[PDB]
């Protein structure tokens, strides 16, 4: 019944990364937006910058866009971290 | 960018 458009990306960072460089957070935000814009129209992009698992959520216009994003990003490397990407479970908050 | 840095 739910056609999932929201992708949850994990291990993109650790919140300590933002302790001693105030610019890293927005650099990461835009890195993600630039990459994800190739997968579909982005409706909302959020970084949970105090979440210990390094979490981001990207919501797309179409569920096929979320699928393409998940296919391309899961297991990819970002700043020395191997990230995961999965469809939102519809219930967990970050 | 940080994309793909291992
Ligand atoms: Cl946004
Ligand atoms: Cl539209």
Numbering used by the authors:
A (entry chain A): 260 to 353
B (entry chain B): 99 to 104
What does the original paper state about this entry?
One element of this ATP requirement is enforced by the nonessential U2 snRNP protein Cus2 (human homolog Tat-SF1), because splicing extracts from Cus2-depleted cells can form pre-spliceosomes in the absence of ATP. Tat-SF1, the human homolog of Cus2, associates with the U2 snRNP and has recently been shown to bind the U2 snRNP protein SF3b1 through a U2AF homology motif (UHM) in Tat-SF1 and a U2AF ligand motif (ULM) in SF3b1. UHMs adopt an RNA recognition motif (RRM)-like fold but have diverged in ways such that they no longer bind RNA, but rather interact with ULMs. Here, we show that Cus2 contains a conserved UHM (U2AF homology motif) that binds Hsh155, the yeast homolog of human SF3b1, through a conserved ULM (U2AF ligand motif).
To view in detail, the interaction between the Hsh155 ULM and one of its binding partner UHMs, we determined a 2.0 Å resolution structure of Tat-SF1 bound to the Hsh155 ULM (residues 98–112). Considering its high binding affinity for the Hsh155 ULM and sequence similarity (55%) to the Cus2 UHM, the Tat-SF1 UHM offers a readily crystallized model system for studying Cus2 UHM-Hsh155 ULM interactions. The Hsh155 ULM is bound to the characteristic α-helical surface of the Tat-SF1 UHM and has well-defined electron density. The positions of the characteristic UHM and ULM residues are conserved. The Hsh155 R100-W101 residues, respectively, interact with Tat-SF1 E286 (Cus2 D204) in the acidic UHM α-helix and F337 (Cus2 F253) of the UHM “RXF” motif, in agreement with the importance of these residues for Cus2–Hsh155 association. In a similar manner as T296-P297 of the SF3b1 ULM4, the C-terminal K104 of the Hsh155 ULM is stacked against the Tat-SF1 W336 side chain. These consistent conformations of the Hsh155 ULM and SF3b1 ULM4 suggest that an extended interface between the C-terminal ULM residues and the “RXF” motif is a shared feature of the Tat-SF1 and Cus2 UHM. A nearby Cus2 aspartate (D201) is likely to account for the additional arginine (R95) at the N-terminus of the Hsh155 ULM, which is disordered in the Tat-SF1-bound structure. The structure of the UHM of Tat-SF1 and the ULM of Hsh155 suggests several features that could explain the higher binding affinity of the Hsh155-Cus2 interaction compared to SF3b1–Tat-SF1 complexes, including (i) an intermolecular Cus2 D254–Hsh155 R100 salt bridge as opposed to the intramolecular SF3b1 interaction (e.g. ULM4 E295–R292), (ii) cation-π stacking and hydrogen bond formation between Hsh155 K104 and Cus2 Y252, and (iii) additional salt bridges between Cus2 D201/D204 and Hsh155 R95. Altogether, we conclude that the ULM of Hsh155 binds to the Tat-SF1 UHM in the characteristic fashion observed for other examples of this protein interaction motif, and the structural similarity between Tat-SF1 and Cus2 provides a detailed model for the molecular basis of Cus2 UHM binding to the ULM of Hsh155.
